[PDB]
Structures are given as structure tokens and as C-alpha cells.
Amino acid sequence: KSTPIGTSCQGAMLPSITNVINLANQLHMLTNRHDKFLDTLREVKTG
Amino acid sequence: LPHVVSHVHTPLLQAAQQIIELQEAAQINAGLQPTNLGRNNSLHDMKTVVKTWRNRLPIVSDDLSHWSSIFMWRQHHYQGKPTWSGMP
Amino acid sequence: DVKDDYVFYQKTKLTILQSLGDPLYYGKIQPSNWFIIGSKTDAERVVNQYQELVQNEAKCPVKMSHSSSG
Amino acid sequence: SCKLLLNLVDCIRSKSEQESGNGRDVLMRMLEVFVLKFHTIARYQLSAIFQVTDCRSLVKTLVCGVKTITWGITSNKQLQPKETQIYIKLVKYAMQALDIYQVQMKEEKEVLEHFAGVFTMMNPLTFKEIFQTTVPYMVERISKNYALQIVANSFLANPTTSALFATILVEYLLDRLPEMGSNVELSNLYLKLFKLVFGSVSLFAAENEQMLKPHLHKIVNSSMELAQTAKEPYNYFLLLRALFRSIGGGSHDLLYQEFLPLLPNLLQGLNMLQSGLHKQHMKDLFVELCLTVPVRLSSLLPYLPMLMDPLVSALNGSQTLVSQGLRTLELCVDNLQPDFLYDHIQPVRAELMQALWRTLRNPADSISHVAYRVLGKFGGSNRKMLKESQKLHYVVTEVQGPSITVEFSDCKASLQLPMEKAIETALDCLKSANTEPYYRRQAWEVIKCFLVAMMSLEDNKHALYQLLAHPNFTEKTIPNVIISHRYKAQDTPARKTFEQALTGAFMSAVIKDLRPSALPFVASLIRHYTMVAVAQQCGPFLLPCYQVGSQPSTAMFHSEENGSKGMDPLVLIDAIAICMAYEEKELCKIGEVALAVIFDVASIILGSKERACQLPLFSYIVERLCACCYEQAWYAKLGGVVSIKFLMERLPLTWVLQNQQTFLKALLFVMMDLTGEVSNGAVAMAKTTLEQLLMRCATPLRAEEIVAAQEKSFHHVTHDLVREVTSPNSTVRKQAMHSLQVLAQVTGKSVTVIMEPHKEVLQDMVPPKKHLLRHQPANAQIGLMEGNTFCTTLQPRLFTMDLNVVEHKVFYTELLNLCEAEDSALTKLPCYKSLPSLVPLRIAALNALAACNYLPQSREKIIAALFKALNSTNSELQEAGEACMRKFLEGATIEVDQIHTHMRPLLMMLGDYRSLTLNVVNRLTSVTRLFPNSFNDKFCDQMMQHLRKWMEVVVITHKEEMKICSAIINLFHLIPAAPQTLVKPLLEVVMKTERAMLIEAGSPFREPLIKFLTRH
DSSP states (O other), rough: OOOBBBBSSTSSOOTTHHHHTOOHHHHHHHHHHHHHHHHSOOOOOOO | OOOOGGGGGHHHHHHHHHHHHHHHHHHHHHTOOOOSSGGGGHHHHHHHHHHHHHOOOOOOOOOOHHHHHHHHHHHHHTTHHHHHHHHO | OOEEEEOOOOOOOOEEEEEETTEEEEEEEOOOOEEEESSSHHHHHHHHHHHHHHHTTSSOOOEEEEEEEE | OOHHHHHHHHHHHHHHHSOOOOOOHHHHHHHHHHHHHHHHHHSSSHHHHEEEEEEEHHHHHHHHHHHHHHHHHHOHHHHHHHHHHHHHHHHHHHHHHHTHHHHHOOOHHHHHHHHTTTTTTTTTHHHHHHHHHHHHHHHHHEEEEETHHHHHHHHGGGSSSSSHHHHHHHHHHTTGGGTTTTTTHHHHHHHHEEEEEEEEHHHOOTHHHHHHTTTHHHHHHHHHHHHEESOOTTHHHHHHHHHHHHSSSSSOSHHHHGGGGGHHHHHHHHHTTTTSOHHHHHHHHHHHHHSOOOSSSTOGGGGGGGGSSSHHTTTTHHHHHHHHHHHHHHHHSSSSSSHHHHHHGGHHHHHHHHHHHHTSSSSSSTTHHHHHHHEEEHSSSSOOOOOOOEEEEEEOOOOOOOEEEEEETTOOOOOOOOEEHHHHHHHHHTSSSSSHHHHHHHHHHHHHHHHHHHSOOOOSHHHHHHHOOOSSSSSSSOOOOOOOOOOOOOHHHOHHHHHHHHHHHHTTTTTTSTTTTTHHHHHHHHHHHHHHHHSSSSSTTTOOOOGOOOOOGGGGSSSSSSOOOOOOHHHHEEEEEEEEEHOOOSHHHHHHHHHHHHHHHHHHHHSSSHHHHHHHHHHHHHHHGGGGGSSSSHHHHHHHHHHHHHHHHHSSSSHHHHHHHHHHHHHHHHHOOOOSSSSSSOOOHHHHHHHHHHHHHHHOOOOHHHHHHHHHHHHHHHHHHHTTTTTTHHHHHHHHHHHHHHHHHTTTTSSTTTSTTTHHHHHTTTOOOSSSSSSOHHHHHHHHHHHHHHTTTTSSSSOOOTTTTTTHHHHHHHHTTTTOOOOOTOOOOOOTSSSOOOOOHHHHHHHHHHHHHOOOTTHHHHHHHHHHHHHSOHHHHHHHHHHHHHHHHTTOOOOOHHHHSHHHHHHTTTTTTTOOOOHHEEEHHHTTTTSSSSHHHHHHHHHHHHHHHHHHHHHHHHHHHHHHHHHHHHHHHHHHSSOGGGHHHHHHHHHHHHHTTTSSSSSSSHHHHHHHHTTT
16 A cells, blocks of 8 residues: 556556657746646555 | 346246236136126126137247146136036 | 228217229228228228227217218 | 404495495495505505514405405496406506515415405406406516415315416417427426416316317427427426326316327327437436327227337336336237237337346336236237347457556565456446435546556656757647548547546536546646647657658557557547537536647647647547537537537637638538427527628638638638528528528628629529429428529529520429419329428419519419419418518509409409408408508498498307407508598497497407507
């Protein structure tokens, strides 16, 4: 009950934003809001 | 029984006809009572029962054992009518 | 052309009509609607069923009268 | 004071019977004071508001006095009209007085009982006169005061009132019957009055069966044809059930013989309504209306097969419908010689036998026992070989669904458990009706944790900033890539499950007690879905399927053999389409918010709104949203219309011009598939959206590209709009004609200029080419006739028609040969067989005769045909004949000799008694409306003798007819140059009739007379 949830089905995984790199003002505030949202969304466990 | 209908469900549906006929034939003895004999209650209902038994018929795919069971049971009440008219 | 009428407190009639041109029967119950009827054998089955139904839940009349025209 | 006057009335009565004096004026003098007392306490009570107790005591005391004074007067005799006006003022003021009881039972019902019984012992002739005049005021008072139902149901304790007041009540309701379905509380209250009046006829079988015998077709028929195009037709179907329980099971005699000629067209209608996918409880209502008909087993054999489809539906889950379905089936099994029944049950034998087999497992002793008895009644027909075998469950593919890796503390082993069924169960729980919110939160947690854990978490604050700040985002042009679902091969077993999870998240974000904890979460995910999508299909980091020259091929989607490298961000649009296509319209608000959020994110990180419109994602959005308008359901079409409206009003105009043709086609298919029963008000919204689209796109302006795009879209749109000019469907044809008028109104151009470059479409369509008017169905015949009428109605004439040049003789003579055969006996044709009316077919040809009036070489035939229609017997046919006569009135001239020779029969039957019927009077007043010079003073003098004869007959036959004498006087209003010396004699006989009948309150001989009187 203290480990992050992982899935072994990488074929159904939704790719990240950076995944396109390996396959080769308001903007700054929007980035901060998403970074904060991802920070609090990382702490999801299987408990 | 299994959800789908197959040969295993035949005996229950095959014996359902004779189960209600036992209740239907239970009124034969009530209508033959001498207290209420000869009235229209024991005359119109008797004809309806006879006509109802004459109409319905099972399918020929059934075994001859069930055909006999229905017919001799019907014959038992059919032969009971001359028993009280024989002693206008 | 075969026109057969049937007379049965209430008074409802059954009519059988056949138009010239095709052997297809038609029916109408009068207490421009038309009924679809097949061959001759289907005609009496409807008539016998209709006669049986009307004979039961009246109980005041007892009779049977019919005629033909054509 | 009223208490003392309560017992003082008998003293006046006792002294009045001793000697013949004057006591009638005294008794009516206080009555007017009491009437004025009602006004004083009712007018000032609104501004005034112990008080309440005193007010109700005064009302109760005065009402008892009113009942007492009426008791001594009546205890009949005919009442003078003057005091009937006082009673009109009394009843009008009494309703306003009955308002103190609202702010504060047992005594409330008692006092209303005394008030309702005042008019029971009154003269029935004057009783119906006052209530008919003041029937709309009483209905309006009920709309504001809900306590009048106590008075309403007290009208049937045991009076003779319900036998007469109900006739006026039903006539008023039938007059405003089409009003039902628009409002909410007005329709329900009208339905409540229908239930109460149907309760009275059902409870009292005497002198109520005769009242319901006439005007019964309108209740049965007009309810059906008005529920097709309405907003809430649920009230119409609630009214038909009440009638069924009253026309049968109780009052049965002359009502059974009247409902028989309606079963053909009614039973064949309910069969079509129950085959739809409208709602869940609506279908249960349809199968209840189709079954339990107030008709015995006889006179039902020809229509027996039409009661089998509802029987199957009633035996498919509903608790009450299965019990009723078994009862209906048992009644047929009882006395039907089941060999006859087996013949008519064969088409639905497989479905019915399976339904009966499955109804033996429910935990109920009142259903399984009945079903087992019914099955035992069949001889051997319950086990015969079924031609269709039972359906089986199979798995199409062999793959692995989503799983969660859970590790243990023993032997270092991980476990992967599937949760494909868990998401489906969570969706069912969120879609359930009676579930506690605790399990809803748990179901929402399952969706939330699965959705978060499925996606990856990377690029924290470093890679996201570099990608968004990279160049070639606002400079490089976006390549034109079209994304379509037409190339989709097959839905993978995982895509459907992931789609269901998204729909649950959207549905959980709108339900209350979970909305505040889900809106930021859902909105943030949608932002994440868009940013990952735009990072994949952009310029600098385009995938090989997103090249300048690319294809919409299967590699775009996530599939087995040709995938998109795993879970492309394209399922969000699919979830939006499904939620907008839900049976509940509460998901449209969140649907448009999500669309606004998607565009808001794209417009920020791209620089401009017009550049975001070129991004390939919006190409898939419109195709997905316009595909919801092709489903057979009506709620799905509404979701597409809302999506069309939102994308039209928000996203700029330059985008709309490119996709205007696609939007027009989607908005046009909705009005075509919905013909029999349309919707709960969907085509009205579709017409408004189409009208708004035309005004926005055709609005004149200013760059060269916008003008070129506007005219390019104009050419493509107008080409499609001339295609349905001769369409067989009347709904699209009328919309297309109205489409052209509004299009020319917005722009600074005429109508014919628009249709100049597209004449080649209509050259060989609006005229008959290689076809005849007898080999085609009447649906196409009407459309072609209306097309010619619209083609030759503008003052600029297109497709000029001249007889003896080319092919204009066969078409002309065909429509002349249509206005001769009247009865259906002479028109016994295979094509003209299913035409119950045949009236609208003659109307379209009749309008064509009046449309062409520029050919003077042949006018005798058209004039004779026009006068033949005016001399017809039908009312609707004659009214339209007057309409085209008025349309033809703008011709060159109408000679008097033509009129004299065409109205010869009317003068021939003028000198007869049994010839001046309603139809003839309607014909006579119609022909005198136009050409206001056809008669003289001698004809007026003769008509004065006729009305004297008419008014002498009524006064004898009284102790239908009221309308004809009201119409004959109304004819004098239309005719000009009537003699001035006839005014006195006509008003003298009117008073004589008003003195013999003793009626003064709004006589039918008053409304046309006052208009007739004011000329001189």
C-alpha cells in the first residue's frame, strides 16, 4: 500500500509530451500550473 | 437447470399439461355429485372441459408413454359418465 | 362475385366480398375499412372463429341466418 | 348584521305569501349590495395583506346568507336576464374573494361545498348561459388558485350539474387543446381537469354517455397528430389512457360503436411508436396504450398480429408489464382454438417462447406460477423446433486487457489483475437511479485512479518549457492533414474500455456532491490531452504520418496491425460525442465547456486563432460530431445540433465558410429522417440553427481571401439548396423555399440572380422529362406541382411555359383532367389506393391553375376549373379555392358575364327551403367577399324574408342552428350597398327572438350585428 501503480502494458500507455523527441506571460504561467498539477498527481498509490 | 432450453427441460414442460389437467379434472367429480347433478353448472362446464380436451394435442415427437398417460387419464373420466346414468 | 352476409340486442354483421380480376377475398365488419383474406379455406376459418366469438358473450339471442347475392 | 339577516329572509317570505305585494325588488336590492360587498373585500385584500379569522368568518357568514336567500327565492321558474348579469358579477367577484383561505382542511372544504351547491337548484337554461360566458375566467382562476379542485370534485356529489357543465368544459378544452405541450404547469392543470371530467363520466353512467358520444374523434385523433411535433408530448399520451378507462369498463353502449371506426388508424399508429428508441419509460407507456384496449375479443381478429410486438416488449423486464402481458396472453389462450392462434403467432413465436421461458426465474410467486400455468395450457406448441436458435456469447479476439501490477512481500512475485468489468460496473453505478452516494464516490475513485495510473509522468519542468519555447510554432505553416474515422478497421478491446472510463469521468463531473472535487481534475486532464496531441502533430516534431503529403490511413488510429505507437490522444473526442449523445441533456453544458477549453488551450500556445483552425485535430472533430446526427435516435441528433451551434457561434467565420457545406448537410438530414413522430422539439431547433447559419455566412463585409472564400462557399451552398425544390418531402421543400427568401433578404441581391448559374439543374427536373404524372407516387406529384407554382410566382418569370411549342400540352391537359372526379368510387386505381383524404392532391394542381395567368389565348378552361372548385361541397377544398381565387384576382380583369354563367345553379336552388345549409351559406359569403358588385336591393329584400322565416322556425323548434343564423346576418356585413331602410326591421325581429328566448349576454346575433350596425 506504499508503492506507485505501474502497468506492464506499454502498448496501451498514453505517450508523454517528450515522447516525440526520442522518436526522431500566459505561456509561462500555464507551464507552472501544469507542473504543479503533475506534482500533486504523482502521489497516487494503490491503497 | 441450465439457462438454455434443451432435451433436459422436456419432462418438466411435458408434464405441465397434465398437472393443470388434474386441477381441470378435479371439477369432474364435484359436478357429478348427486346434490348438484343435472343443473346447468354441471352441464355447461362439462361440455367446455370436453371441448378443451379435444382441441389441445401434444407434438408427435414425444414418446408413447406420455400419450398413454394423457389419454387413459382422460378415459377414466370419460367412462365415469355411464356409471351414473345407468342405474329421459 | 360472391357476396355473403351474416346476421347475428346488438347487431353486428360480417361481409365477404370478392372483386372481379383476382381470386383475393375481402371482409368488412359493420356494427371504407377492408380485410385481407387469402384462399377459400381461410374464409370459413375466420367466419367460424367470428361466429364462435359472437355466439358466446351475448346469451340473449339464439339463431343463425345468412343469405347471398351473386 | 349578516347573522341577523340570515334568519330574517323567512320573515319576508312569510309576509310576502299573505298578500300580493312588492317583495321581488327588495330581495334583489340587497343582493346587489351583497355583490358589491364581494368586490369591496376582494379588491382591497391585496393591498391590506385578528385579521385572517375575521375575514374568513365574514366570508363564511355572507356565503351562507347568499345560499339562504337563494333557497327562499327558488323554494323551477325561468329567471329574468337582468339578474343573470348580477350573478355574472357575483361569480366573477366571488373568485377574487376566495383568497383569504390561501394564507391560512375541514372547514375550508365545508364552506366550498355550500358555495358550489348554490347553482345546483337553478334553471338549467340560465345555468348553461352564465357558465358558458364565464368559462374562461374560471379556468384562469384555477391556474392561480389550486384550492378550486375541492369545488371541482364537489360538482359530482349527486347533482344534475355535472351532466351539463361538463359539455361546456370539454368544448373549451378542445378549443385550446393544441396549446397543451408548450408550457409545463398549464398542461398539467389542463390534464387534471381532463382526469376529473373523465372521473365524472365514469362514476355517473347516466346522461354522460350521450355527452361523450359526439366530438370524440377529435380527442382521439388530434391528440395523435399534435404529439408528433411538440416539446412535451408526454401529456398527450397521459390523456388517452384516461379516456380508455372511461370508454370501457363502465359506460359502454353507444361509445363502443363509436370507437370502432378509429381502431384501424389508431392501432397501426401505436405499433410504429413502440418500435422506436425514444426513452426507457416512454416505451413502457406505449405498450400500455397499445394493450388493454377497451375492445373485446371480437372485432379484433383482422388486427390480431399488430398486438404481438407490444406483447414481446411487455414481457422483457418490467414488473407490471409482465403481469399484464401474461393476462393478455391468457385471455387469448382461453377461447381461440389455439390452432388458429398458432397460425397468427408464428412470426413472433421464437421471441414469445423465449420470453415465457425466461419469466420462470424471477423471485415472485404471482408471476412464475401464472407463467407456468399458461405454458401448461399449450398442448405441444411450447416445445416445437424453433427456426432460430438461442444466441451465444463469443469473444472476437484473443488479447489481454488493462491490468494493474500489484506486488507481494512473499517470494518477490507480482500480480496483474484485470479490471475490464470493474469499469463497466462503475459506469452502471453512475447511471443507476437509486444508489447511495458512498458507492458513487468509490466508483469515481476507481475511474480516477485507473485513469491517472495508466498515463505516464515525466518531463518535470524541463522538457515542457523547451518544446513550447521552440521556434517554428508561430512561423512555419501547418500542413493540410485530414483526419477521418472512415478508415478505422476495428475497435480494439482496450479502446472501448478506455472510452468508458472517460465518459464516467465526464458524467461524474456534473453530478452534485462530486462537482467541486472533479471540475479542476477533469479540466486539467483535457489540457493534458490537448498539449500532448498538439506536440505530436505539430511542425518541428511531426510524426511520419503527419508529413506535408500524408494519408488519413489506418496508421493514424490505435489498432493491432497498424497502430499509432500506442494510445494516440484521439479518444477524448469520442468521449465527448458519446456524452453529448446521452439520453439526459445535462451533459451538453459540460460538453460545450470542454470544447471551449480545448480551443482556449490551442489558441494560446499557437499564437493566433486562425492558425489553430488549420490544425488537423479540428478536421476529426466535425466528422465525429456530425456522425451523431445519423443515428436513428432523437437525443443523439439534438447533441449534434448543439455541437453545430457551439462551433458556429464561437470559432471564427473564415473556418465556417470552408465547412459550411458539411454543416448544412448534417442539419438537413435531421428534418428528413423524422417524419412520422419527430421528437420532443428538435426540428424547431434545427430550423433556427440553419437560419442562423445562413445569416452569418451571407452577411456582407475585407481581404481578398475572405471574399473569395465567401463566394466559393456561396456557390457550393446555393447549388445544394436548389436540389430540394422538387423534393417529395414537404418539410425540406418548405425549408428550402424559405431558405431562398432569407438568403436574398440578408444580401443586397434579388432571388432570381442567385439561381442564375445553377439553372442547368432545374432545366429537366421541375418539368416532367421521360416520366408521367400517373406512374409516380402522389408524394412526388405534390412536390413537382409546388415546384412549378414556386417557379412561376415571382414577378421575374423563369422557365416560361407556352402550350403548343414543346411538351407543354401533355402536362397541361393532365392537370386539367384532375379536377373532375370527386368521389373515390370512380378513382379506384392501384396508385390512388392509400389516400384517406385525396384533398391535398387536388390543392397543388389547383394552385398551378392560378399560378399561370399570362396566357390569354386559353382561359375558359382554367376559369371553369376555378369556379368548379368554388362550387365544391367540401369545406377545406372550398376555402383553398377561395385562396387561389384571391391569388388569381390580380390578373387582367374578370368579366361579369363569366360570373353570371358560372353561378347559375346557386340561383336555381335559391328558391327552396331545404337548400340554405351551412355549406351553401359558407359558399355564398365567400363569393360575395370579392367582386363587391353582384347583387341589388331586391336580393337584400328577399334575404330579409328568408331570415324572418329562419327566425320563425327556431322559436318553434327550440321549445347547429344557432351558427347558421349567426352566419346569415354576418353575410350582410360583407355585402356593400345594403339599403338603409332595412335596418329597423332586422333589429325588431332580433329583439323578438331575444324576447322569446330571453337572452341578453353576448348573443351570437350581436357580434356580427355591431359590426353591421356601425357602417351608418
